[PDB]
Amino acid sequence: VIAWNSNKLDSKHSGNYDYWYRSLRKSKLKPFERDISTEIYQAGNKPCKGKGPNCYFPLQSYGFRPTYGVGHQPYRVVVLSFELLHAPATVCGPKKS
Amino acid sequence: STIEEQAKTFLDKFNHEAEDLFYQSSLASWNYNTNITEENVQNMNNAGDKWSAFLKEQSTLAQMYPLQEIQNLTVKLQLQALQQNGSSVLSEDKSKRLNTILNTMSTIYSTGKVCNPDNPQECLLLEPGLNEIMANSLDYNERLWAWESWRSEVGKQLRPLYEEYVVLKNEMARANHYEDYGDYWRGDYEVNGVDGYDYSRGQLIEDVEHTFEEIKPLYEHLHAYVRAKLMNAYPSYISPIGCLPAHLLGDMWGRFWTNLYSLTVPFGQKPNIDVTDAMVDQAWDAQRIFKEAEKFFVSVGLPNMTQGFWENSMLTDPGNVQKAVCHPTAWDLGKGDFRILMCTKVTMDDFLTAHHEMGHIQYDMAYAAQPFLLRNGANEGFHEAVGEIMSLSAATPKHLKSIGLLSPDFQEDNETEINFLLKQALTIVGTLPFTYMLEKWRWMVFKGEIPKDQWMKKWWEMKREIVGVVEPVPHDETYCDPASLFHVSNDYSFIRYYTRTLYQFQFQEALCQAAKHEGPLHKCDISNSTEAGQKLFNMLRLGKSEPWTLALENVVGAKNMNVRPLLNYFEPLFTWLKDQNKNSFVGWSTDWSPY
């Protein structure tokens, strides 16, 4: 897992609402699964038909600002996933000559 | 999905936008205080209106969750805090009338002016002139004249609005499922649903009365000593057995008695311990003071200050380029953006104020782990208590010698200790009975025991019975004296000072038991002690997720408030007061000036 601070790159005045995160979902996500569904999360037995009681938007925006603390600064995270399937290894490290 | 899961989902969805709007409002307030401009004023007003509308909408929408089907205390407290509509539950006309009355009272209190009888055009204002006359003047005519003018300005021209304000507040309290406004203010002290930690509103009153009765001998001896000392400074004015006049108390309202230290000092032949001259000779600045305070707070085990704190706090007066207000207050913008606005200079008072502000910021960072609805101390007095105990720990001679302000060959005698104890008593203990009397009078007014025409009479009766202040000028029922108070005219509590004093004394008695210390209690220093630091941080991080009784017992080991720490602290001063009053009259007579 690779991560680094990007306060001077992703921050913007009056809040940088370009970044969002999912906080509500019907169930947990499987590893290596991607889902960009924007359906309103139904928190009750009543059918969901719009914004209101027991119907909240599952996506929330960060709003990065340069005056935030170290714990709230934007951090770009890159995770390297290696595959070891039964196939010739086309990817290798550098070799010194 | 049960009701608890839905409530948790609602809280998680609401807290994000709540913190966002709170940070926006805090940034607007910071821009207003650092630069007073029309654009900043408009932005702050818009942010406040948006925040009020958001709170009203959230309180209206939060009524769908019942409190009877909640088994989690952290969620139940947040639901109870959200269900309180506040002033937004009243109608439009009543809300507009209440706001108009509040604005009128604020303008009357702010525009308080004292003019001379010979020159009606020659007038003065409160802060530069009236405080200087009541604090640094020895004339019987000028002080009494200024006090009478200030008492005549705020009065009969405000009671017809104050009564309607009280009626509207009672209606608002009855609309929020409360008996009266007093029970609404005491709602934070009531705890229910906890095994062995329940607390009632009457129990608080009983404990306050018991603490007052236990302090009564010490306050009586202190008042007798102050009267005996002021009798020589004002001959034929201070009664030997009667009460003391209000204009000679050293305060506009008789709250603090610190101004009388120049005339009531027992050992004025030697200067008091002051590190101002040391900082002037060493040419220090506010940056060095804040660095020393940060090192002191880190040495006890607390985390260091954040980078944004040092990169955004205005710890130095910018001058004429910015219209900044030199008013030291704690600022918590949220999301790690902690700032401090203070025009710190090279003085011991500014040193203690900076230590108090840093203690407040450390507390804010401590309870920052709790959600936005719980980002607050266990009560309205924990912050000030922590700040005061930190200031007292920093003001110790050992810490001053360690930081390099005092010489290593410095010594301390009993006279300096007695002077320091007398100063602390005049600063803190001098306002306790006045606070108790004001709070009891306001509670009885809210209860309706004094309906129409016994306000001023019973007010002065209780004042002469508890505090012992005689009227220097005959008054009547129209002169509403309590209306001139800062906290009464602006709708602020007053018992919070007594609560924070009790909490400060209890914390001073508790934390000094773990840290190694020898000698009296006022010399206790918790520096370089990780045990006491961890014991305090275990309580500072609780926030409002737990009742104040459990948080207090986790520190002092007691399930209820206690006042014996104050007696153990002032015993060295109490013995000297008894020795001085052994040959003098004790007490005060309530019969004086038969007008």
PDB file of N, CA, C and O in Angstrom, chain B residues 171-201:
ATOM      1  N   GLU B 171     -42.476  30.570  28.502  1.00  0.00           N
ATOM      2  CA  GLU B 171     -43.300  29.916  27.488  1.00  0.00           C
ATOM      3  C   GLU B 171     -42.464  28.991  26.612  1.00  0.00           C
ATOM      4  O   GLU B 171     -42.906  27.891  26.258  1.00  0.00           O
ATOM      5  N   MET B 172     -41.249  29.417  26.258  1.00  0.00           N
ATOM      6  CA  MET B 172     -40.366  28.569  25.465  1.00  0.00           C
ATOM      7  C   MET B 172     -39.975  27.313  26.232  1.00  0.00           C
ATOM      8  O   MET B 172     -39.929  26.216  25.662  1.00  0.00           O
ATOM      9  N   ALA B 173     -39.688  27.453  27.528  1.00  0.00           N
ATOM     10  CA  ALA B 173     -39.341  26.291  28.339  1.00  0.00           C
ATOM     11  C   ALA B 173     -40.522  25.336  28.472  1.00  0.00           C
ATOM     12  O   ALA B 173     -40.351  24.114  28.402  1.00  0.00           O
ATOM     13  N   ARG B 174     -41.729  25.876  28.662  1.00  0.00           N
ATOM     14  CA  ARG B 174     -42.911  25.024  28.733  1.00  0.00           C
ATOM     15  C   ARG B 174     -43.208  24.361  27.394  1.00  0.00           C
ATOM     16  O   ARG B 174     -43.810  23.283  27.357  1.00  0.00           O
ATOM     17  N   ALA B 175     -42.797  24.988  26.288  1.00  0.00           N
ATOM     18  CA  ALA B 175     -42.979  24.376  24.977  1.00  0.00           C
ATOM     19  C   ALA B 175     -41.988  23.247  24.722  1.00  0.00           C
ATOM     20  O   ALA B 175     -42.262  22.377  23.889  1.00  0.00           O
ATOM     21  N   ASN B 176     -40.849  23.241  25.416  1.00  0.00           N
ATOM     22  CA  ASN B 176     -39.828  22.214  25.254  1.00  0.00           C
ATOM     23  C   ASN B 176     -39.899  21.146  26.342  1.00  0.00           C
ATOM     24  O   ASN B 176     -38.875  20.546  26.687  1.00  0.00           O
ATOM     25  N   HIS B 177     -41.093  20.905  26.888  1.00  0.00           N
ATOM     26  CA  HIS B 177     -41.315  19.875  27.907  1.00  0.00           C
ATOM     27  C   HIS B 177     -40.496  20.146  29.169  1.00  0.00           C
ATOM     28  O   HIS B 177     -39.832  19.255  29.704  1.00  0.00           O
ATOM     29  N   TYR B 178     -40.544  21.385  29.650  1.00  0.00           N
ATOM     30  CA  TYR B 178     -39.916  21.772  30.904  1.00  0.00           C
ATOM     31  C   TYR B 178     -40.897  22.578  31.743  1.00  0.00           C
ATOM     32  O   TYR B 178     -41.831  23.193  31.219  1.00  0.00           O
ATOM     33  N   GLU B 179     -40.677  22.570  33.060  1.00  0.00           N
ATOM     34  CA  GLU B 179     -41.557  23.311  33.956  1.00  0.00           C
ATOM     35  C   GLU B 179     -41.314  24.813  33.856  1.00  0.00           C
ATOM     36  O   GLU B 179     -42.266  25.601  33.841  1.00  0.00           O
ATOM     37  N   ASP B 180     -40.051  25.224  33.785  1.00  0.00           N
ATOM     38  CA  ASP B 180     -39.706  26.636  33.682  1.00  0.00           C
ATOM     39  C   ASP B 180     -38.302  26.750  33.106  1.00  0.00           C
ATOM     40  O   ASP B 180     -37.643  25.747  32.816  1.00  0.00           O
ATOM     41  N   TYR B 181     -37.851  27.996  32.940  1.00  0.00           N
ATOM     42  CA  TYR B 181     -36.538  28.235  32.352  1.00  0.00           C
ATOM     43  C   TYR B 181     -35.414  27.762  33.266  1.00  0.00           C
ATOM     44  O   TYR B 181     -34.341  27.378  32.782  1.00  0.00           O
ATOM     45  N   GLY B 182     -35.637  27.780  34.582  1.00  0.00           N
ATOM     46  CA  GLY B 182     -34.628  27.272  35.497  1.00  0.00           C
ATOM     47  C   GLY B 182     -34.382  25.785  35.321  1.00  0.00           C
ATOM     48  O   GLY B 182     -33.235  25.332  35.326  1.00  0.00           O
ATOM     49  N   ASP B 183     -35.456  25.008  35.164  1.00  0.00           N
ATOM     50  CA  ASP B 183     -35.299  23.585  34.882  1.00  0.00           C
ATOM     51  C   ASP B 183     -34.705  23.352  33.500  1.00  0.00           C
ATOM     52  O   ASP B 183     -34.023  22.344  33.281  1.00  0.00           O
ATOM     53  N   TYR B 184     -34.954  24.265  32.557  1.00  0.00           N
ATOM     54  CA  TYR B 184     -34.344  24.149  31.237  1.00  0.00           C
ATOM     55  C   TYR B 184     -32.836  24.361  31.308  1.00  0.00           C
ATOM     56  O   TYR B 184     -32.073  23.671  30.622  1.00  0.00           O
ATOM     57  N   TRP B 185     -32.391  25.312  32.132  1.00  0.00           N
ATOM     58  CA  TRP B 185     -30.956  25.527  32.294  1.00  0.00           C
ATOM     59  C   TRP B 185     -30.315  24.403  33.100  1.00  0.00           C
ATOM     60  O   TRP B 185     -29.179  24.002  32.821  1.00  0.00           O
ATOM     61  N   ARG B 186     -31.024  23.884  34.101  1.00  0.00           N
ATOM     62  CA  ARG B 186     -30.519  22.782  34.909  1.00  0.00           C
ATOM     63  C   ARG B 186     -30.715  21.421  34.254  1.00  0.00           C
ATOM     64  O   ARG B 186     -30.430  20.401  34.889  1.00  0.00           O
ATOM     65  N   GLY B 187     -31.195  21.379  33.008  1.00  0.00           N
ATOM     66  CA  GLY B 187     -31.390  20.104  32.342  1.00  0.00           C
ATOM     67  C   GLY B 187     -30.095  19.380  32.035  1.00  0.00           C
ATOM     68  O   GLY B 187     -30.080  18.150  31.921  1.00  0.00           O
ATOM     69  N   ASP B 188     -28.994  20.122  31.896  1.00  0.00           N
ATOM     70  CA  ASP B 188     -27.703  19.499  31.636  1.00  0.00           C
ATOM     71  C   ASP B 188     -27.161  18.768  32.857  1.00  0.00           C
ATOM     72  O   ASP B 188     -26.350  17.849  32.705  1.00  0.00           O
ATOM     73  N   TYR B 189     -27.594  19.149  34.060  1.00  0.00           N
ATOM     74  CA  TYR B 189     -27.128  18.493  35.275  1.00  0.00           C
ATOM     75  C   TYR B 189     -27.919  17.234  35.603  1.00  0.00           C
ATOM     76  O   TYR B 189     -27.446  16.411  36.393  1.00  0.00           O
ATOM     77  N   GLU B 190     -29.102  17.066  35.018  1.00  0.00           N
ATOM     78  CA  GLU B 190     -29.934  15.906  35.303  1.00  0.00           C
ATOM     79  C   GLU B 190     -29.464  14.707  34.489  1.00  0.00           C
ATOM     80  O   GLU B 190     -29.241  14.815  33.278  1.00  0.00           O
ATOM     81  N   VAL B 191     -29.313  13.564  35.155  1.00  0.00           N
ATOM     82  CA  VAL B 191     -28.863  12.329  34.527  1.00  0.00           C
ATOM     83  C   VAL B 191     -29.849  11.225  34.878  1.00  0.00           C
ATOM     84  O   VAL B 191     -30.206  11.057  36.051  1.00  0.00           O
ATOM     85  N   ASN B 192     -30.287  10.476  33.868  1.00  0.00           N
ATOM     86  CA  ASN B 192     -31.225   9.381  34.064  1.00  0.00           C
ATOM     87  C   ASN B 192     -30.801   8.193  33.215  1.00  0.00           C
ATOM     88  O   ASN B 192     -30.145   8.349  32.181  1.00  0.00           O
ATOM     89  N   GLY B 193     -31.184   6.999  33.663  1.00  0.00           N
ATOM     90  CA  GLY B 193     -30.893   5.783  32.935  1.00  0.00           C
ATOM     91  C   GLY B 193     -29.521   5.195  33.171  1.00  0.00           C
ATOM     92  O   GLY B 193     -29.099   4.324  32.402  1.00  0.00           O
ATOM     93  N   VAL B 194     -28.809   5.637  34.205  1.00  0.00           N
ATOM     94  CA  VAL B 194     -27.485   5.125  34.535  1.00  0.00           C
ATOM     95  C   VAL B 194     -27.542   4.520  35.929  1.00  0.00           C
ATOM     96  O   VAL B 194     -28.048   5.150  36.865  1.00  0.00           O
ATOM     97  N   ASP B 195     -27.023   3.301  36.067  1.00  0.00           N
ATOM     98  CA  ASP B 195     -27.058   2.591  37.341  1.00  0.00           C
ATOM     99  C   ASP B 195     -26.080   3.236  38.316  1.00  0.00           C
ATOM    100  O   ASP B 195     -24.861   3.129  38.147  1.00  0.00           O
ATOM    101  N   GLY B 196     -26.611   3.904  39.337  1.00  0.00           N
ATOM    102  CA  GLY B 196     -25.776   4.498  40.361  1.00  0.00           C
ATOM    103  C   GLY B 196     -25.208   5.856  40.030  1.00  0.00           C
ATOM    104  O   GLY B 196     -24.276   6.304  40.704  1.00  0.00           O
ATOM    105  N   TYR B 197     -25.739   6.535  39.007  1.00  0.00           N
ATOM    106  CA  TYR B 197     -25.236   7.853  38.642  1.00  0.00           C
ATOM    107  C   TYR B 197     -26.361   8.836  38.328  1.00  0.00           C
ATOM    108  O   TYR B 197     -26.125   9.827  37.625  1.00  0.00           O
ATOM    109  N   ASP B 198     -27.570   8.590  38.824  1.00  0.00           N
ATOM    110  CA  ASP B 198     -28.674   9.508  38.591  1.00  0.00           C
ATOM    111  C   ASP B 198     -28.458  10.814  39.347  1.00  0.00           C
ATOM    112  O   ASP B 198     -27.826  10.850  40.405  1.00  0.00           O
ATOM    113  N   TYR B 199     -28.995  11.896  38.788  1.00  0.00           N
ATOM    114  CA  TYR B 199     -28.859  13.216  39.385  1.00  0.00           C
ATOM    115  C   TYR B 199     -30.114  14.019  39.085  1.00  0.00           C
ATOM    116  O   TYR B 199     -30.658  13.944  37.980  1.00  0.00           O
ATOM    117  N   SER B 200     -30.570  14.785  40.073  1.00  0.00           N
ATOM    118  CA  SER B 200     -31.779  15.583  39.953  1.00  0.00           C
ATOM    119  C   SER B 200     -31.442  17.064  40.066  1.00  0.00           C
ATOM    120  O   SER B 200     -30.363  17.446  40.528  1.00  0.00           O
ATOM    121  N   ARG B 201     -32.390  17.899  39.634  1.00  0.00           N
ATOM    122  CA  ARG B 201     -32.186  19.343  39.690  1.00  0.00           C
ATOM    123  C   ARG B 201     -32.187  19.859  41.123  1.00  0.00           C
ATOM    124  O   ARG B 201     -31.455  20.803  41.439  1.00  0.00           O
TER     125      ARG B 201
END
